[PDB]
Amino acid sequence: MLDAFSRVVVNSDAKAAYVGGSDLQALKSFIADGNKRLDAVNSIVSNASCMVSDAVSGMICENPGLISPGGNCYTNRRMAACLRDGEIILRYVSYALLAGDASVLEDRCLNGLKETYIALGVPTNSSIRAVSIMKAQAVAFITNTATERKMSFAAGDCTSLASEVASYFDRVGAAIS
Amino acid sequence: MLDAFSRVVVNSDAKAAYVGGSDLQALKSFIADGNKRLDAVNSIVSNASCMVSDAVSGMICENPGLISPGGNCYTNRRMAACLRDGEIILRYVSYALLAGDASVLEDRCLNGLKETYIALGVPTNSSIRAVSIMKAQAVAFITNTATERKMSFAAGDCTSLASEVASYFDRVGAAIS
Amino acid sequence: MLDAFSRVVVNSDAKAAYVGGSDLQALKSFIADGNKRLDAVNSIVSNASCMVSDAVSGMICENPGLISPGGNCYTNRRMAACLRDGEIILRYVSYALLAGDASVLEDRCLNGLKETYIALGVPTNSSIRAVSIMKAQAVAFITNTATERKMSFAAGDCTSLASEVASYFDRVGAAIS
Amino acid sequence: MLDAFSRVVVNSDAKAAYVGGSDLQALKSFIADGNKRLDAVNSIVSNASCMVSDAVSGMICENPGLISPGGNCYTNRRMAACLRDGEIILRYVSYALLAGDASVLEDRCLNGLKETYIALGVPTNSSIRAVSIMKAQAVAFITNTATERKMSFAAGDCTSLASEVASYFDRVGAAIS
Amino acid sequence: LTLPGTAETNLAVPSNAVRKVQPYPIAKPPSYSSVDSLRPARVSRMDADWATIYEQVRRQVMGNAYVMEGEAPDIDVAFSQLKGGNLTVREFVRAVGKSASYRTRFMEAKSSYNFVLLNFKHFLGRAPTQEEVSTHIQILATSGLEAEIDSYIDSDEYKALFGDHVVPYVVYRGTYLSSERFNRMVKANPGGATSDKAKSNLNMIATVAADLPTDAIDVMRGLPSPITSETLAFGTAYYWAKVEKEASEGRSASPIGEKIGKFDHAPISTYTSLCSYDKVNKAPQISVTNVGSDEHSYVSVTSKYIAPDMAAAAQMLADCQKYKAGGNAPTGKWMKYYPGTTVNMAPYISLNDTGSDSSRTVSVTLDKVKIS
Amino acid sequence: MKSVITTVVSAADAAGRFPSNSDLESIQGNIQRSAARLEAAEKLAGNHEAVVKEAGDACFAKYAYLKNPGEAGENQEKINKCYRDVDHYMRLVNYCLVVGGTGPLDEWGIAGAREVYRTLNLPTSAYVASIAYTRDRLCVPRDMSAQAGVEFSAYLDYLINALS
Amino acid sequence: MKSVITTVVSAADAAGRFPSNSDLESIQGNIQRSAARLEAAEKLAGNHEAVVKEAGDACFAKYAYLKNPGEAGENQEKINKCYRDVDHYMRLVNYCLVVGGTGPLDEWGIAGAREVYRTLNLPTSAYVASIAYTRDRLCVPRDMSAQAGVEFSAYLDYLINALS
Numbered sequence A, B, C, D: 001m002l003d004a005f006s007r008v009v010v011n012s013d014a015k016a017a018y019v020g021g022s023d024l025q026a027l028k029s030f031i032a033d034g035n036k037r038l039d040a041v042n043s044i045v046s047n048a049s050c051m052v053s054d055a056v057s058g059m060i061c062e063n064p065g066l067i068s069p070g071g072n073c074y075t076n077r078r079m080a081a082c083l084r085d086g087e088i089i090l091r092y093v094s095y096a097l098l099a100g101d102a103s104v105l106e107d108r109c110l111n112g113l114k115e116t117y118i119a120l121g122v123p124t125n126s127s128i129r130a131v132s133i134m135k136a137q138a139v140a141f142i143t144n145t146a147t148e149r150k151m152s153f154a155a156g157d158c159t160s161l162a163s164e165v166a167s168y169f170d171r172v173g174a175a176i177s
Numbered sequence E: 001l002t003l004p005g006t007a008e009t010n011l012a013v014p015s016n017a018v019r020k021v022q023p024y025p026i027a028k029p030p031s032y033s034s035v036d037s038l039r040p041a042r043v044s045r046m047d048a049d050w051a052t053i054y055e056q057v058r059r060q061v062m063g064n065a066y067v068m069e070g071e072a073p074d075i076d077v078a079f080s081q082l083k084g085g086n087l088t089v090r091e092f093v094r095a096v097g098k099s100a101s102y103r104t105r106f107m108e109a110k111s112s113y114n115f116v117l118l119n120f121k122h123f124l125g126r127a128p129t130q131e132e133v134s135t136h137i138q139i140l141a142t143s144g145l146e147a148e149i150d151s152y153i154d155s156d157e158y159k160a161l162f163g164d165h166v167v168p169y170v171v172y173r174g175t176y177l178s179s180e181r182f183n184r185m186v187k188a189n190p191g192g193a194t195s196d197k198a199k200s201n202l203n204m205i206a207t208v209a210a211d212l213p214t215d216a217i218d219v220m221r222g223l224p225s226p227i228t229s230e231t232l233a234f235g236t237a238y239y240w241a242k243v244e245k246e247a248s249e250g251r252s253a254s255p256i257g258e259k260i261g262k263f264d265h266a267p268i269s270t271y272t273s274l275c276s277y278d279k280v281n282k283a284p285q286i287s288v289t290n291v292g293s294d295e296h297s298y299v300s301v302t303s304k305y306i307a308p309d310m311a312a313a314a315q316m317l318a319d320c321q322k323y324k325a326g327g328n329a330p331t332g333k334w335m336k337y338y339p340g341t342t343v344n345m346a347p348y349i350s351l352n353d354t355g356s357d358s359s360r361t362v363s364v365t366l367d368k369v370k371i372s
Numbered sequence F, G: 001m002k003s004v005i006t007t008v009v010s011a012a013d014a015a016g017r018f019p020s021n022s023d024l025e026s027i028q029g030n031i032q033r034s035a036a037r038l039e040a041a042e043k044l045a046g047n048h049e050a051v052v053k054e055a056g057d058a059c060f061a062k063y064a065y066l067k068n069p070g071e072a073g074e075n076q077e078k079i080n081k082c083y084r085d086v087d088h089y090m091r092l093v094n095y096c097l098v099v100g101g102t103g104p105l106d107e108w109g110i111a112g113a114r115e116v117y118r119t120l121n122l123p124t125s126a127y128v129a130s131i132a133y134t135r136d137r138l139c140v141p142r143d144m145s146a147q148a149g150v151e152f153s154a155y156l157d158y159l160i161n162a163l164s
């Protein structure tokens, strides 16, 4: 819905202001890391299936109450859903990393996620653990500090995008808490 | 949904236990009155149209306040609804007599029956008197103590199924109270 | 087993109380005249919805100023409250016929009900006539001398139970006045 | 207790009182031959609904002018009011039988009956004929000489209470002479 | 399965045997509809590929089903003919609805009333009125499942909104046939990350579409409205009212309390002797059977049963509104407040000891099964 | 779940009618069939630890590659996870002998197997080798009745056919 | 039509799957029930002209008002229409004793009865007077076996409950 260029136009629509040379250079800096953001989204979706499968099994291996019967990841259909439930979280933070602001996931992924997991009986403390693994791994890829997979890049700074995707992964955690 | 066979597996699924020879004879006891259960459902739906028409008109003949204008069972549409409304209760209790447990009618017929009858404005004290006539005639048929209609049967005891259907008809009454 | 019945009627932590097959004759050996006493409550609670709708309408047709403007059974917020209150007296007196003691009836139902009805402005002239119809309605069902409904029973005398509820309805008439 | 029974009657409002079994044996000791006298009231008021429905029906078959148009029992407003005066004689002679005096019969009932029957056009020569049937009906019930309903009794003689109620019924008839 | 060109099956109307397939998808409804310019574009058969036609049929007709790869082969039967052109996408959702994968997550698991409300949510993309339910609940009583899904797809409301080539979606049309019918549609259709499977009772539109008044709550309609049409009103003002309608909409808090069933109870200081307001209106719920030697006697305590406000409506007001001709012949004022009151002895029956008598005065009127 | 009762009760409800004389006739077969399959259940429940021990390692005897490092069985505990992974399958065919249909096997063991065994790299050919080792090891005089060996084998190859 | 086979083979097709062990088990009920009802069909086909002669007239013995002029029975030939109009029902009870379900009774005799019997002024109470007169005259020693008379009565009252 709203990207990063369209975020400042609704900040300027509330003032009825022509967007000009006092904040275009703040948006010209966004295009200055245009390729830095562009390589960052590609590294998330490069190893995207190994992202979520390590993340949900790391949530299982620290808490085996879900594999116990009565747990919410006991049966085979629910593990197939929980592999796919965390995949949609990766699919929308990769949208919001590309769009530059948390607007595309806040209404398509977060609007309605809390009452779906309450009425299902999903343990909310475990899904907090499930997405915080994905916070620690998405900053491990775009800082190129992944130990088992190193990708080649043009060398430089990328920690401004590291707090960007880490701000998104606490937005999915706040709406489920 | 859950029959009498699948009721003892979901009790055993929470224990992760194999079904063994400590409660299989309790389930093999259920099959021993297989034909006793089978003739009992056939005697219910034999006289099923004469069941509900004697039940609703008996509720009218003791409480003639619904036939008065402004009453709930006043007009010709709502009596056609009320003859249909008690017919669904007979249709789903007969499913629970065939399935052996109150699990098919509980999530389909009773789930949300309480606020449906409140919001439409059904007199809930008269709905207790409606299905209590359907309770006392359901035990009148499967013990074959019905005076005007006697059906031939193989001789024996059938009072274990008489406590079964009488435990269903007050589950309907408790869900609407 | 009556302790289990008395603990659930003073609203302790159980939801309901079921009596089995072997416990039912154990209850019948406990109280005196256990076959007739279960038949007396089965006459009352099968016609509880007809009795309090007749006794409230019997109270209105004696003193018609209750449904005049300024009355207590005008504004059908109040009239549904009075139709509730007749059932609560009938449901507590049918337990006391079953238990054989009025001790539940005095401490759960009747202490402070004289103080509640003077605080609500409930008139004690018509409220005694609401009980005095329901004494005569309950005593006609027990000896099966109702005018319309004649229910089938094993024959005999039940006038020891018929004078028991007239003592129990007189305790409602004492504690309201 | 009898002063408390005096507080039931004279209060000009609806009131009710009972006597428990500890207090009952003091009442049987205070009155003389009270097991006859408590059987004396219970013979009458258990058949009071047929007693007034046969005596004022016997008044009509001796004087058919009251069902003439314009006669005083022509409409059902007047016909139900004739039975309403029929029962209220019969309760006030029963408590006069129960207390053993006639002072509650004169002061609560008969003071002002001649002043209200001439003002209402009530035929006093016909209502004396109605209460003399009720004098003749009650002496059959007190000596168990009714031809239809004969009641079981601890045997003995109660002709002293037969003359006691006939001294109460003519005090009604001398009050409206 | 039938033919490589088939516009309509089952020969319900006579003029479908001569009716062509639509050569192009139907247009949008011609009213203004300010909401739909913020909405995403509708997906049709002839603009999009089979990867997203299958997803939006899962996102609308299946709700949010999470169909697996081994799950729903009946849909994989019906999808394999739609890619071959063997049936239109109008007939495809008829084949989806009549299939058992639609039945085994919406028909057997939901309730009888909720199955109709989910059918208007999936097929028509709205929420019905009470008269639309009452004509659809008789098809579930007399004709069953297959004729009830025929009432949506062969209706004229479907063919004007979508036709033969357009996937079903929430059609904002601006000028509606009722003002309720906008906001009951909107409440029935939330956005992403919501399904129908957890709410085995839906329980909120099952009681707004039940009685014809009591339109639903505003925060239950400001929630799924689109964006730059909700904002500056969902930062923290109605946001805590939302995050509540969500812990109540989730787990299905039954709306006897605050929505319909609206009783002004007395304050807790008014009684105080019949105290402990957890209790207060509890009765023994007693049941006897007395059949053979298995008849039990289930004496439960019942819940706080409320005055039902319609059984007190039919009777005590509509019923028994007699009370006529009440001059009652006022002659002689010796009475006191009790004109004709019998002493009413009423002997509690002499079971030989520990049973005793009490008396009470009452006004006595003869009944209507009495004289002549 | 998907039993023979829930087949005919939901079909009578999707038609919107009473239980007809076909539906009462369908349950009459279960008296003739539960006498054979319920003793196959207690023969499975009384021998469930042996049929996981000496038949779960036959997948490792056939597929001796996967105990190499970098692969699906790394250490000793994932082999202990693997004998837990097949104990649920032998629980579920015990759970379907007691029902009479294939009800508890589909949504609890089958539905979603194409997802979780593709993402977690679990080879389904090593699953079905352990199950078909149990399938051909049935015989009449030792194990069970001659009739229960038909239907106990008839549930196992449905697990083969759904996993492959 | 709606048999016990076509119930379970359409529910397997609407799910889109193979006939499983729940579907194979329902046909095993037909081995135990076809000995009972196929004897009842031969007792019905060998006595069909008797059970419409001395049982079709019993509606007219109950309803002698129908033979009045201006009614549904006017002349001799509509009474000869009527015994054909009842013999088609007894052919249909014979047509469903050999199926096992209520298949040929529904769309051939029931589906559409509320239309043609209301428009042409035929009282359905005088239909079910003739049908239930055949229902109460079943007995074990003369008519059939003890089990065939249960099922033959179980298809008659389904026709009573459909028309009433």
Ligand SMILES: *C(=C)C1=C(C)[C@@H](Cc2[nH]c(/C=C3N=C(/C=C4\NC(=O)[C@H](C)[C@H]4[C@@H](*)C)C(C)=C\3CCC(=O)O)c(CCC(=O)O)c2C)NC1=O
Pocket (backbone or CB within 6 Å): B062, B063, C047, C050, C051, C054, C055, C057, C058, C061, C062, C132, C133, C136, C137, C140, C141, C145, C146, C147, C148, C149, E365, E366, E367, E368, E369
């Ligand atoms: C108003 C003018 C007026 C009334 C309203 C009506 C009230 C009333 N009813 C009775 C007596 C009984 N009511 C009974 C209850 C029922 N009878 C039934 O058959 C059904 C099952 C049920 C609900 C309607 C019964 C059993 C009785 C006693 C016998 C009888 O049938 O009459 C009374 C009399 C009470 C008394 O005498 O104290 C009254 C006042 N009557 C009105 O006049």
Ligand SMILES: *[C@@H](C)[C@H]1/C(=C/C2=NC(=C\c3[nH]c(C[C@H]4NC(=O)C(C=C)=C4C)c(C)c3CCC(=O)O)/C(CCC(=O)O)=C2C)NC(=O)[C@@H]1C
Pocket (backbone or CB within 6 Å): D047, D050, D051, D053, D054, D055, D057, D058, D060, D061, D062, D132, D133, D134, D136, D137, D140, D141, D145, D146, D147, D148, D149
């Ligand atoms: C109600 C049926 C009571 C009951 C009452 C008794 N009535 C008794 C006597 C009696 N009754 C009448 C009226 C009756 N006789 C008629 O000729 C006509 C119609 C014209 C009617 C309605 C009369 C006149 C009498 C005689 C008394 C008198 O004349 O004063 C009676 C005593 C019987 C007896 O005399 O042996 C009783 C007990 N009877 C019952 O059992 C039910 C409970």
Ligand SMILES: *[C@H](C)[C@H]1/C(=C/C2=NC(=C\c3[nH]c(C[C@H]4NC(=O)C(C=C)=C4C)c(C)c3CCC(=O)O)/C(CCC(=O)O)=C2C)NC(=O)[C@@H]1C
Pocket (backbone or CB within 6 Å): A032, A033, A034, A035, A036, A037, A038, A039, A040, A042, A141, A142, A143, A144, A153, A154, A155, A156, A157, A158, A161
């Ligand atoms: C940050 C998370 C990374 C990182 C990013 C940098 N990228 C730099 C230059 C650069 N990046 C791309 C990638 C992008 N362009 C494409 O065409 C496609 C595929 C479709 C992708 C994914 C390109 C072409 C360039 C060249 C631009 C240029 O040098 O002129 C870069 C250098 C500075 C800059 O140009 O922004 C950085 C720092 N490098 C890292 O170390 C982390 C891991």
Ligand SMILES: *[C@H](C)[C@H]1/C(=C/C2=NC(=C\c3[nH]c(C[C@H]4NC(=O)C(C=C)=C4C)c(C)c3CCC(=O)O)/C(CCC(=O)O)=C2C)NC(=O)[C@@H]1C
Pocket (backbone or CB within 6 Å): B032, B033, B034, B035, B036, B037, B038, B039, B040, B042, B141, B142, B143, B144, B153, B154, B155, B156, B157, B158, B161, F021, F024, F025, F028, G033, G147, G151
């Ligand atoms: C209990 C509520 C009844 C009652 C039941 C008994 N039934 C007995 C035997 C039995 N029942 C059937 C009926 C069933 N079989 C069918 O083929 C069909 C229709 C398709 C139905 C509805 C059959 C065949 C049999 C014979 C079984 C046999 O004897 O081998 C029975 C005897 C003991 C038993 O077998 O369970 C009883 C007690 N009888 C009653 O008196 C009440 C009313």
Ligand SMILES: *[C@H](C)[C@H]1/C(=C/C2=NC(=C\c3[nH]c(C[C@H]4NC(=O)C(C=C)=C4C)c(C)c3CCC(=O)O)/C(CCC(=O)O)=C2C)NC(=O)[C@@H]1C
Pocket (backbone or CB within 6 Å): C056, C066, C072, C073, C077, C078, C079, C081, C082, C083, C085, C086, C088, C089, C108, C109, C113, C116, C120, C122, C123, C126, C127, C130, E264, E265, E266, E271, E274, E280, E281, E282
């Ligand atoms: C009806 C026959 C009466 C009458 C009744 C009214 N009661 C009203 C409120 C009320 N009543 C009770 C007592 C009842 N509730 C119990 O839980 C128990 C036993 C433990 C009994 C006997 C209570 C406690 C309350 C207040 C609490 C509440 O209703 O929520 C009432 C409403 C008063 C008003 O709104 O003004 C009425 C009209 N009034 C009559 O005229 C007849 C005699």
Ligand SMILES: *[C@H](C)[C@H]1/C(=C/C2=NC(=C\c3[nH]c(C[C@H]4NC(=O)C(C=C)=C4C)c(C)c3CCC(=O)O)/C(CCC(=O)O)=C2C)NC(=O)[C@@H]1C
Pocket (backbone or CB within 6 Å): D033, D034, D035, D036, D037, D038, D039, D040, D042, D142, D143, D144, D153, D154, D155, D156, D157, D158, D161, E347, E348, E349, E350, E351, E352, E353, E355, E356, E357
């Ligand atoms: C003349 C009117 C009667 C008659 C009267 C007698 N009753 C006798 C004894 C008796 N009566 C009762 C029941 C009565 N007493 C009570 O305390 C209560 C209420 C709680 C009632 C209804 C009892 C319990 C008894 C005692 C019986 C016993 O213990 O054996 C009686 C015997 C002498 C006496 O005790 O007064 C007489 C003469 N009996 C008749 O035959 C005519 C018809």
Ligand SMILES: *[C@H](C)[C@H]1/C(=C/C2=NC(=C\c3[nH]c(C[C@H]4NC(=O)C(C=C)=C4C)c(C)c3CCC(=O)O)/C(CCC(=O)O)=C2C)NC(=O)[C@@H]1C
Pocket (backbone or CB within 6 Å): E001, E077, E078, E079, E080, E081, E082, E083, E084, E085, E086
């Ligand atoms: C395989 C042994 C054949 C072959 C098969 C192909 N079939 C193709 C499409 C297709 N097939 C059917 C019939 C099938 N689907 C059904 O739903 C039913 C019955 C209910 C049946 C028998 C349909 C309807 C369709 C169209 C739907 C679709 O295309 O998915 C197909 C794809 C053609 C293509 O696009 O290349 C193939 C290859 N063809 C062969 O060469 C061998 C002999």
Ligand SMILES: *[C@H](C)[C@H]1/C(=C/C2=NC(=C\c3[nH]c(C[C@H]4NC(=O)C(C=C)=C4C)c(C)c3CCC(=O)O)/C(CCC(=O)O)=C2C)NC(=O)[C@@H]1C
Pocket (backbone or CB within 6 Å): B056, B066, B072, B073, B078, B079, B081, B082, B083, B084, B085, B086, B088, B089, B108, B109, B113, B116, B120, B122, B123, B126, B127, B130, E111, E112, E113, E133, E134, E137
């Ligand atoms: C008759 C014994 C009652 C009574 C009945 C009425 N019910 C009315 C509507 C209605 N009832 C239900 C529940 C029932 N129908 C179903 O389809 C299912 C299961 C799927 C059940 C349990 C529903 C869902 C509805 C709404 C649909 C409809 O209105 O047809 C009704 C109509 C009210 C009106 O509009 O006037 C009546 C009269 N009411 C009574 O007074 C007696 C006690």
Ligand SMILES: *[C@H](C)[C@H]1/C(=C/C2=NC(=C\c3[nH]c(C[C@H]4NC(=O)C(C=C)=C4C)c(C)c3CCC(=O)O)/C(CCC(=O)O)=C2C)NC(=O)[C@@H]1C
Pocket (backbone or CB within 6 Å): C024, C033, C034, C035, C036, C038, C039, C040, C042, C142, C143, C144, C153, C154, C155, C156, C157, C158, C161, E288, E289, E290, E291, E292, E295, E296, E297
């Ligand atoms: C007075 C209220 C009645 C009356 C009562 C009698 N009932 C007699 C026997 C009896 N009653 C029941 C049903 C009852 N017992 C239970 O266990 C249950 C619930 C599970 C109930 C409702 C049974 C089972 C029996 C035993 C014999 C039978 O089956 O009928 C009875 C005879 C014994 C005695 O004299 O004490 C009487 C007198 N009968 C009446 O005439 C009035 C109206």
Ligand SMILES: *[C@H](C)[C@H]1/C(=C/C2=NC(=C\c3[nH]c(C[C@H]4NC(=O)C(C=C)=C4C)c(C)c3CCC(=O)O)/C(CCC(=O)O)=C2C)NC(=O)[C@@H]1C
Pocket (backbone or CB within 6 Å): D056, D066, D072, D073, D077, D078, D079, D081, D082, D083, D084, D085, D086, D088, D089, D108, D109, D113, D116, D120, D122, D123, D126, D127, D130, E327, E328, E329, E330, E331, E335, E338, E339, E340, E341
């Ligand atoms: C019946 C056998 C008589 C007869 C009776 C009528 N009485 C009428 C009204 C009436 N009666 C009384 C006295 C009565 N009420 C009491 O509260 C007490 C004791 C404290 C007694 C003795 C009163 C006070 C009233 C007026 C009040 C009222 O009823 O509303 C009456 C109605 C007359 C009318 O409606 O115009 C009748 C017909 N009349 C007869 O024909 C026979 C002899």
Ligand SMILES: *[C@H](C)[C@H]1/C(=C/C2=NC(=C\c3[nH]c(C[C@H]4NC(=O)C(C=C)=C4C)c(C)c3CCC(=O)O)/C(CCC(=O)O)=C2C)NC(=O)[C@@H]1C
Pocket (backbone or CB within 6 Å): F043, F044, F047, F050, F051, F054, F136, F137, F138, F139, F140, F141, F142, F143
């Ligand atoms: C039937 C196919 C053959 C047969 C095979 C043999 N099995 C032998 C030993 C053995 N078998 C099993 C599995 C068995 N136990 C079970 O609980 C079930 C299923 C319910 C089965 C199939 C085990 C665990 C063992 C080890 C020893 C034991 O526990 O019995 C065997 C001996 C040689 C060997 O170990 O391979 C043979 C020949 N036996 C027969 O008689 C028929 C022909």
Ligand SMILES: *[C@H](C)[C@H]1/C(=C/C2=NC(=C\c3[nH]c(C[C@H]4NC(=O)C(C=C)=C4C)c(C)c3CCC(=O)O)/C(CCC(=O)O)=C2C)NC(=O)[C@@H]1C
Pocket (backbone or CB within 6 Å): G043, G044, G047, G048, G050, G051, G054, G136, G137, G138, G139, G140, G141, G142, G143
């Ligand atoms: C069984 C309930 C009784 C019984 C009744 C009698 N029936 C008598 C004659 C009769 N019965 C029938 C109907 C019979 N024929 C059939 O083809 C079938 C079912 C396929 C049935 C039930 C007819 C047509 C007739 C007329 C003469 C005849 O053909 O038998 C009868 C003789 C007296 C009479 O005519 O009413 C009796 C007593 N018979 C029994 O043995 C058991 C107790």
Ligand SMILES: C=CC1=C(C)[C@@H](Cc2[nH]c(/C=C3N=C(/C=C4\NC(=O)[C@H](C)[C@H]4CC)C(C)=C\3CCC(=O)O)c(CCC(=O)O)c2C)NC1=O
Pocket (backbone or CB within 6 Å): B047, B050, B051, B054, B055, B057, B058, B059, B061, B062, B132, B133, B136, B137, B140, B141, B145, B146, B147, B148, B149, C046, C148, C149
């Ligand atoms: C005021 C009007 C009035 C009525 C309309 C009837 C209605 C009616 N019937 C029964 C009671 C019953 N109703 C039936 C029903 C039937 N009996 C048959 O033989 C047929 C198959 C079917 C009706 C067509 C049966 C079997 C009983 C049990 C008593 C009996 O065997 O007759 C009951 C008592 C229910 C109970 O005990 O809880 C009532 C109220 N009674 C009335 O007082």
Ligand SMILES: C=CC1=C(C)[C@@H](Cc2[nH]c(/C=C3N=C(/C=C4\NC(=O)[C@H](C)[C@H]4CC)C(C)=C\3CCC(=O)O)c(CCC(=O)O)c2C)NC1=O
Pocket (backbone or CB within 6 Å): D068, D069, D070, D071, D072, D123
């Ligand atoms: C042609 C001339 C002519 C008459 C002779 C009278 C005849 C007469 N008197 C009464 C009617 C009556 N008559 C009496 C009179 C008596 N009842 C008693 O108990 C007393 C002993 C006695 C009088 C001494 C009473 C009490 C009424 C009923 C009062 C009334 O009808 O209003 C009625 C009935 C009227 C009605 O139905 O309302 C008639 C026609 N009227 C006439 O138009």
